[PDB]
Design a binder for this molecule. Structure first.
Ligand code: BEF
Ligand SMILES: [Mg+2]
Length: 259
């Protein structure tokens, strides 16, 4: 008999600042050095795709455009993938191939779960140190943006009748890499991440409502138009985020309500 809320977050320029570092709009809006903005943006970009290629089978899975990690779970036999050799299995077919596809997404899921709170372990040294230094420069230049978004994400997580869902235009694998490198692994259960690169956010929202029911209250949080328009088409309240203040306002609302 408890009211339940489903928070449908956007990632880029909502929870994290990354793309706006390359375009110079963030540095320009808050008076930061544009040259530092771009340097940091490119370094993080390198780390995101390097983690993607090296550990999340990005060169293998990219051309699939999958929406959710479990979309091809039908073809998984559930075997142990601890010693399974992905390189020598000839993936690059339509049935024995579907099984190898599924194996890869589940191994991604396993990597994500064992390393979500130990990204330094996954990334390995010396990348870990460079990563911690990058995150440090990033937090400074963005005036603790991530610190603010996390405060809302963690209040949502700790609250019993609230849940965190993620919908991003970023492709699925790179999205998981971003989420991991920005320390969001522990706040977003992998089964709650959706990539709207191709089906679009409206479809993803519809799918998320099918999954959580009509009795739950949805709140679409984001900085972009797509997300807002999709929220209208489904009569889902929309919470826009344009600056730190907006993340603080969400946090405030989150702490005054007991469900
Ligand atoms: F992550 Be959202 F698509 F900017
Ligand atoms: Mg966005």
């Amino acid at each position: 008999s408890h009211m339940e809320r489903v928070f449908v977050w956007d990632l880029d320029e909502t929870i994290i600042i990354f793309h706006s570092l390359l375009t110079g709009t963030f540095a320009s809006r808050y008076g930061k050095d544009t040259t530092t903005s771009v340097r940091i943006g490119l370094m993080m970009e390198e780390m995101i795709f390097n983690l993607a290629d090296t550990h999340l089978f990005f060169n293998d899975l990219e051309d699939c455009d999958q929406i959710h990690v479990d979309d091809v779970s039908s073809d998984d036999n559930g075997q142990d993938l601890s010693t399974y050799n992905f390189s020598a299995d000839g993936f690059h077919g339509g049935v024995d191939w579907m099984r190898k596809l599924a194996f890869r997404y589940r191994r991604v899921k396993e990597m994500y779960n064992t390393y979500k709170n130990n990204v330094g372990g996954l990334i390995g040294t010396p990348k870990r140190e460079t990563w911690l230094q990058l995150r440090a420069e990033l937090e400074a230049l963005t005036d603790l943006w991530l610190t603010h978004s996390l405060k809302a994400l963690n209040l949502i997580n700790s609250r019993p009748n609230c849940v965190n869902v993620l919908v991003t235009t970023t492709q699925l694998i790179p999205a998981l890499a971003k989420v991991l490198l920005y320390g969001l692994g522990s706040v977003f259960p992998i089964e709650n991440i959706y990539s709207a690169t191709k089906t679009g956010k409206e479809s993803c929202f519809e799918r998320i409502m099918q999954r959580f029911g009509r009795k739950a209250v949805y709140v679409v949080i984001g900085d972009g138009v797509e997300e807002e328009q999709g929220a209208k088409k489904h009569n889902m309240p929309f919470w826009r985020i344009s600056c730190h203040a907006d993340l603080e306002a969400l946090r405030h609302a989150l702490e005054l309500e007991y469900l």
